[PDB]
Amino acid sequence: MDEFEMIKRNTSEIISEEELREVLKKDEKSAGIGFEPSGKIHLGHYLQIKKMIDLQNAGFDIIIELADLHAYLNQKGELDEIRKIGDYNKKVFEAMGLKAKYVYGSEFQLDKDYTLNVYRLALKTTLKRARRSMELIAREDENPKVAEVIYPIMQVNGCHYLGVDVAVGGMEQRKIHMLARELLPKKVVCIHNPVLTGLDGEGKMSSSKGNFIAVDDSPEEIRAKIKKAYCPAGVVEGNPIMEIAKYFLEYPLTIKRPEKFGGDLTVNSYEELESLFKNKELHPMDLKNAVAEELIKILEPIRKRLLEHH
Amino acid sequence: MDEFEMIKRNTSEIISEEELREVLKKDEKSAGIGFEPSGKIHLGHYLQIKKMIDLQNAGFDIIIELADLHAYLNQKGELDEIRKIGDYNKKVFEAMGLKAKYVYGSEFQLDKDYTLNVYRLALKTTLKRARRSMELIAREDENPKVAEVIYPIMQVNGCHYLGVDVAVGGMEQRKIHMLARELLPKKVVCIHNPVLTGLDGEGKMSSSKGNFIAVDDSPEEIRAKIKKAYCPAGVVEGNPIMEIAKYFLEYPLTIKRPEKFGGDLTVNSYEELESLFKNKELHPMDLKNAVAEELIKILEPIRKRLLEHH
Ligand SMILES: CC(C)(Br)C(=O)Nc1ccc(C[C@H](N)C(=O)O)cc1
Ligand SMILES: CC(C)(Br)C(=O)Nc1ccc(C[C@H](N)C(=O)O)cc1
Numbered sequence: 239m240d241e242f243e244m245i246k247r248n249t250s251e252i253i254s255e256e257e258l259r260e261v262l263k264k265d266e267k268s269a270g271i272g273f274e275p276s277g278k279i280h281l282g283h284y285l286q287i288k289k290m291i292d293l294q295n296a297g298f299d300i301i302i303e304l305a306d307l308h309a310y311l312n313q314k315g316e317l318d319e320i321r322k323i324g325d326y327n328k329k330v331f332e333a334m335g336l337k338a339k340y341v342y343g344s345e346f347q348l349d350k351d352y353t354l355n356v357y358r359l360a361l362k363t364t365l366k367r368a369r370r371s372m373e374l375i376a377r378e379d380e381n382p383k384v385a386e387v388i389y390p391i392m393q394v395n396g397c398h399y400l401g402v403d404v405a406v407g408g409m410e411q412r413k414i415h416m417l418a419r420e421l422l423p424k425k426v427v428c429i430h431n432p433v434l435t436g437l438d439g440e441g442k443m444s445s446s447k448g449n450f451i452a453v454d455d456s457p458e459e460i461r462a463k464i465k466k467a468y469c470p471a472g473v474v475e476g477n478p479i480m481e482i483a484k485y486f487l488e489y490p491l492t493i494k495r496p497e498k499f500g501g502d503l504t505v506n507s508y509e510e511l512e513s514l515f516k517n518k519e520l521h522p523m524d525l526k527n528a529v530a531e532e533l534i535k536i537l538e539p540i541r542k543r544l545l546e547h548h
Numbered sequence: 549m550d551e552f553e554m555i556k557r558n559t560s561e562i563i564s565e566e567e568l569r570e571v572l573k574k575d576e577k578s579a580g581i582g583f584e585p586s587g588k589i590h591l592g593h594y595l596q597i598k599k600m601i602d603l604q605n606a607g608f609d610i611i612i613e614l615a616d617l618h619a620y621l622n623q624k625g626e627l628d629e630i631r632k633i634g635d636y637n638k639k640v641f642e643a644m645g646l647k648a649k650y651v652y653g654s655e656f657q658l659d660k661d662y663t664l665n666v667y668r669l670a671l672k673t674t675l676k677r678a679r680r681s682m683e684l685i686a687r688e689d690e691n692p693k694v695a696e697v698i699y700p701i702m703q704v705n706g707c708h709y710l711g712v713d714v715a716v717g718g719m720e721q722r723k724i725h726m727l728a729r730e731l732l733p734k735k736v737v738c739i740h741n742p743v744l745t746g747l748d749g750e751g752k753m754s755s756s757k758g759n760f761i762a763v764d765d766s767p768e769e770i771r772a773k774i775k776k777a778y779c780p781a782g783v784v785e786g787n788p789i790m791e792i793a794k795y796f797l798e799y800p801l802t803i804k805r806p807e808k809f810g811g812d813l814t815v816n817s818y819e820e821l822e823s824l825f826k827n828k829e830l831h832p833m834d835l836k837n838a839v840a841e842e843l844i845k846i847l848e849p850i851r852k853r854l855l856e857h858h
Contacts, residue, residue: 383670383673
């Protein structure tokens with residue numbers, strides 16, 4: 239498991255693999271990601287932070303953008319309230335064990351030269367290309383605002399201004415990332431993580447859809463959320479419980495169940511688990527119990543560090 | 549002819565007349581207009597500058613924006629070349645007899661607080677409203693740029709930042725102006741001048757359509773441009789020669805013609821001229837001769853001041 243495959247583990251795509259290999263050669267290399275401040279930090283965020291921790295462990299300097307101005311452009315409210323939530327998110331990201339530089343976007347995204355470059359990019363980005371890149375990001379609006387098409391080019395320029403070698407994000411960021419690769423003089427290596435399914439299976443996990451496990455949920459809340467979740471026997475695709483087993487749990491994995499249902503089960507890889515699940519050797523109730531208890535233990539240190547403040 | 553009707557003469561609309569009357573009450577009041585720098589200054593510009601001269605004569609302080617950044621957003625090239633053309637335009641506007649403050653937009657349109665307010669406005673302006681306001685302004689593009697929708701909200705904010713009581717422009721600016729009236733806390737009085745017809749009658753006069761008389765055209769060039777112009781007998785609407793008689797000439801007007809065509813004609817108002825033209829008492833050839841020679845004399849001082857530099 240070289241550093242490449244360590245970075246590559248559980249990503250949806252790397253754009254591009256050859257470029258990432260060149261970047262690994264450098265003594266000095268930086269990786270960046272941004273987050274619109276969120277009232278709750280959920281497993282979708284945690285997935286990203288894990289991936290930033292991998293990069294850090296491969297010798298990357300990590301830059302986290304607390305994207306207060308992007309959230310302002312995406313209709314999350316007033317900058318001061320956004321910035322307060324930004325500060326809470328940093329604490330959560332630190333309680334996740336991430337050592338990084340944290341910057342508020344508004345610290346640099348309003349300088350004369352940043353703005354001028356945003357306007358340069360606005361001359362090279364068609365409205366159609368801009369609106370396409372925001373399809374999975376833009377706040378739902380029957381009357382889309384001009385702010386929606388400023389957003390993607392400000393994120394592009396952020397890549398430029400921060401000078402990262404690698405940009406990380408969920409797959410929803412990939413069209414903004416493609417735009418950065420076409421417009422900017424230095425091509426940024428782009429690493430896209432999968433988009434988790436919502437707990438009810440009905441769509442993608444979102445802080446505004448209320449279908450997530452938050453990293454500071456109480457254990458009873460974790461158990462009740464898993465218990466209700468979409469999780470049909472033998473169905474792996476779009477199954478948020480299997481996604482959690484694949485993305486967050488440690489193997490080998492011991493799955494406790496009564497002797498009358500086969501007794502404790504040990505699986506040495508998520509791949510074995512998927513096999514046991516597909517040919518319906520492992521029942522959804524037992525998968526849920528094991529996933530909930532392991533997730534509880536995995537999230538425990540984070541919830542404890544956050545509760546230590548009170 | 550109070551100051552109101554003097555300001556109102558030969559305008560298409562005043563938004564609104566009651567508001568303009570309130571503004572006239574003030575000892576201190578300012579009027580503003582912007583121009584994307586243009587290689588040639590034509591009668592469309594001159595019409596506007598005349599209207600600024602009226603306002604000045606009514607006691608307005610005049611602010612002319614040399615809109616280098618708007619022209620940059622509207623694909624007129626590089627800022628330095630735009631700014632050079634900006635400087636030429638000022639000279640022309642001064643040779644027209646306008647005493648005013650001249651500012652390059654880029655002097656203030658990149659400050660942190662200006663930019664932040666542009667982004668505030670971008671949150672309140674729908675893409676559809678923004679693209680509607682640019683229909684008569686935007687450079688022709690099969691693939692419209694994001695820059696096209698930044699333009700109108702930057703012009704709105706310019707009104708705000710410069711604090712004018714009155715905004716002046718051609719009718720094509722009216723939708724941007726309407727947006728300023730809805731978004732800004734202080735409603736700006738908007739004065740819209742007519743859009744001149746191109747010399748060939750086929751559309752509106754434009755510096756990029758090459759259908760204009762420039763204020764520094766030589767007399768032979770003026771005569772040849774008038775001679776070729778669209779100008780059908782009895783047709784007033786869309787007739788650029790009548791527009792010039794209405795908007796630029798001084799009355800009473802003596803129209804020279806041979807005795808065999810009726811001999812010299814004196815008309816005491818454009819209204820008489822329109823009457824003589826409609827019931828086909830005045831032939832297009834004689835109208836053209838008179839319009840060209842009077843326009844030559846009217847533009848003479850401007851062409852001379854511009855030529856004095858060489
Ligand atoms: C400048 C660097 C490279 Br650190 C960066 O990635 N900036 C960035 C990234 C993502 C977001 C939010 C995002 N579009 C979302 O959907 O939440 C905002 C800013
Ligand atoms: C700030 C004040 C009030 Br002085 C102003 O009117 N600014 C302004 C006006 C017009 C233009 C150009 C115009 N859209 C065009 O079509 O040429 C650019 C800037």
